[PDB]
Each structure stands twice: as C-alpha cells, then as structure tokens.
Design a protein around this ligand. Structure first.
Ligand SMILES: [Zn+2]
Length: 196
RNA sequence: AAGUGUAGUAUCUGUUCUUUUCAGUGUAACAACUGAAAUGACCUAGGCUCAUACACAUUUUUUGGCAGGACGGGAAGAGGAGACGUCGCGACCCUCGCAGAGUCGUUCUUGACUUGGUCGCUUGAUGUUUCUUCUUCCCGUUC
C-alpha cells in the first residue's frame, strides 16, 4: 500500500516527497505534522489523507502561507474507440483538435430506454498523480468518456494550449463545466465527438 | 504451513451542531443534560419603555305638525313702486396712532382680581309686508 515510497523519519534532517507531511517520529508510528495526528498503518494514513480533517488543516496552512506572504448501473464493455488527433492552428496561437468516432448502430440496437441516452460524451482534465499502478506521473490527460465505450486519454505536456480568454459572451448554462460547453461538439446524428 | 480467549488501551475515518432566551442539574468554569416559551408598538447594540339600570308626559331625541331657434345679463323706447329695518362704492369729513384691555405676585414665562360714526349711490347688496308686458341692439351657453 506504500507504493514503495520511502518516508524519512522526522529526526533525519531533510529527493522530493510526494506529500511532505506524513512522517515517522522518533518512534515507529506515522504522523501528520500539520494535523498532529498519529496513525498506526499506512491504510489509516490514507484514511487521514482522504478525510476532511487533514484537508481543513491543509487549507489553514495555505492561509498561513498567504499570511506570511447512476454510478452503479454504469454499463461497461471497455471497448477502445478510434481517436483522430490533429495539430490545429488559428488566430493567435496553436490548439489541439480530436475527432472521436462511435459505433455504427451495431450494438446500440439493444439499449434504448432513455437512460442517459440523451447525455453526450464528457471530457475532463486529470492529473497523473493518481493511477491504478502509481509508478510514474507528472503530466495531464484529456480524458473522454461515454457510458458503454471505454475511457480514452491524451497526454498534455504543454502547460497550456488553446486555453482561451472569454471566447463567447458569458452565457451561463454550465452543462458540466466551462471546458465542455466552451470547446466541445457532439454530432449525435453521426456519432462524432469533436474536442478543441 | 496457518490459527486461540480473558480484561484493557491507543489511533484513523465516517457521522452530529446553535432561532432566541429563561430556571434547575451538572461542571473547576465551561460543556453537556433537564423543563417552558411572546405578542404588539416606538426611538439612535441599547430601553428605571409601555400593554395584554336607563335616555315616549312641560327646557333638548320619540315632534303641534300638516297644508336659424331657446335661455340668461345689460342698455334704450312705448303702455315695478311705497315703508321698516340690517351690512357695503366714494368723501368735501371726522379723527392721529403698536397694541380683548388694565393692574399685582413670583420667576425667565404664568395665576389671581376688576370692566368704523355721519352723509350721499350720481341708478350698492338683503329679508318682512300690501297693492297692480311687448319691440330693437350687443355679449355668453346649447342644438
Ligand atoms: Zn493531516
């Protein structure tokens, strides 16, 4: 569960840490220096991190820094769709555009009970800091998801591309987020999802 | 090759949380627990704040009460007018000035005590009360 990381003792006088918080004191137990909470096992440590308590102390420490100045029934065939990445350009910079194609009424003929069928594909930017394997990380992914088909990701080394500035005139139908409404199109008649 | 029970401890995480008071328990004080419930008005957190039988028998109300056409002025020409009062336009007149008025006790404002008139109208306005309209011109309303 430790994912092979080495947490140095508090007295070893600090290699960069994943979270520079959880330590081991003079004794063998694990502690959160901010929260000042002792934890028996790494599982308890992860409960602490996933707990609201630790988070509140993180926000308090950030304030100190500024001062110092449906999920169940989800069908899953895990089928990799076909993406068509292509370097785009407009004006005045460079942006990316993806063309994802979906089934041709091949298997979607057995499921038509208006169960989120009206819901279009959704995209989100995920940090690689969390993976099923947790080995390497440090870059973002433009994940795209649809109920039956399997998720898809696209690595984005560049810190920022096509991140525009008030493209439209501030109209508020949040849909899912500014990203989706701002720059996505869902040709539902042909089943083609464009993203740029 | 793996493995139990008695007592007890620590540590995560999840979850809970005030509408306001009052009084009691409780507490080192808290906390916590136990009971009830203000509603209304006003002023710039606050309040010696406030509130929850008869009216019919003499002075009055059950009683002496009842009986081009029309209009409206103003003027002229022909066949409304007397009293008796009561309030006004002018003036040759009268009259000539700051105070309901006049005095005092006590205090920066109150308590007591006493007591337009005249003439015209040169066609001013009005209620008793007796008697006996037409034509023309002008200015307003209506159709
Ligand atoms: Zn913590």
């Amino acid at each position: 569960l430790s994912k092979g990381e080495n947490v140095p003792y508090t007295f070893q006088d600090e290699q960069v840490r994943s979270n520079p918080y959880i330590y081991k004191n003079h004794s063998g137990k694990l502690v959160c220096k901010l929260c000042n909470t002792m934890h028996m096992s790494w599982s308890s440590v992860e409960r602490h991190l996933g707990g609201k308590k630790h988070g509140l102390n993180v926000l308090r420490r950030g304030i100190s820094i500024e001062k110092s100045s449906x999920x169940x029934x989800x069908x899953x065939x895990x089928x990799x769709x076909x993406x068509x990445x292509x370097x785009x350009x407009x004006x005045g910079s460079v942006g990316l555009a993806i063309q994802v194609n979906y089934s041709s009424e091949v298997k979607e003929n057995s499921v038509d009970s208006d169960d989120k069928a009206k819901v279009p594909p959704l995209i989100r930017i995920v940090s690689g800091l969390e993976l099923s394997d947790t080995k390497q990380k440090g870059k973002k992914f433009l994940v795209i998801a649809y109920e039956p088909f399997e998720n898809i990701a696209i690595e984005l080394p560049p810190n920022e591309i096509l991140f525009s500035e008030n493209n439209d005139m501030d109209n508020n139908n949040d849909g899912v987020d500014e990203l989706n409404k701002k720059c996505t199109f869902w040709d539902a008649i042909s089943k083609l999802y464009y993203v740029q």
